[PDB]
Design a protein around this ligand. Structure first.
Ligand code: FES
Ligand code: FES
Lengths: 110, 109
């Protein structure tokens, strides 16, 4: 039906870093969990892109994932969460509210 | 302005890789250009974020730059293009058509 673009922060930072990083919090497995879940559905594979990014400024809330054009921001995402997001949101067009940290704009921005 | 999220591919690949990369095509200078624009402009930071990414699968037309929520895809962006994109697009709200390679969906989809 419509194109959806998923951005997963995979920014890594040293272990004792003040802000920590999404990678340290497992964001790389989240990115990979998305990839294999999309390449597994003929309809999603042709209407959904998953891109790895550097820090998006919401580290305390990592792993951070933002879905455009929706502008939905997810936080503290775990690999086991990917499935529900893909089914309920990417397909059903309904955001998984328990993980949403912001909408229309980044967390903290006015 | 409004709110705009700019994504600049800064993916790089070793010299032997056939596809090369936006980073080899000068995408890091583009990114830094945008970042110099965000600090040097009075109101842009109020409605704008720039994010560096890995490959977005439009390598032949790199440097690739996508702007959301719009869903506008730019190709072959040079540092010297940033300014016109910032003023004409990020503020004015109108895409610099000579660099647009797609809208609403990735190139070739
Ligand atoms: S490290 Fe992921 S948002 Fe900062
Ligand atoms: S390396 Fe930039 S789009 Fe592929």
């Amino acid at each position: 039906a419509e194109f959806k673009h998923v951005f997963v922060c995979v920014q890594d930072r040293p272990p004792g870093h003040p802000q920590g990083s999404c990678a340290q919090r497992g964001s790389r497995e989240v990115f990979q969990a998305f990839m294999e879940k999309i390449q597994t559905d003929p309809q999603l594979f042709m209407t959904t892109v998953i891109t790895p990014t550097g820090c998006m400024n919401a580290c305390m809330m990592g792993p951070v994932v933002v879905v455009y054009p929706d502008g939905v921001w997810y936080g503290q995402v775990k690999p086991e969460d990917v499935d529900e997001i893909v089914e309920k949101h990417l397909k059903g067009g309904e955001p998984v509210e328990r993980l949403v940290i912001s909408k229309g704009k980044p967390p903290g921005m006015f």
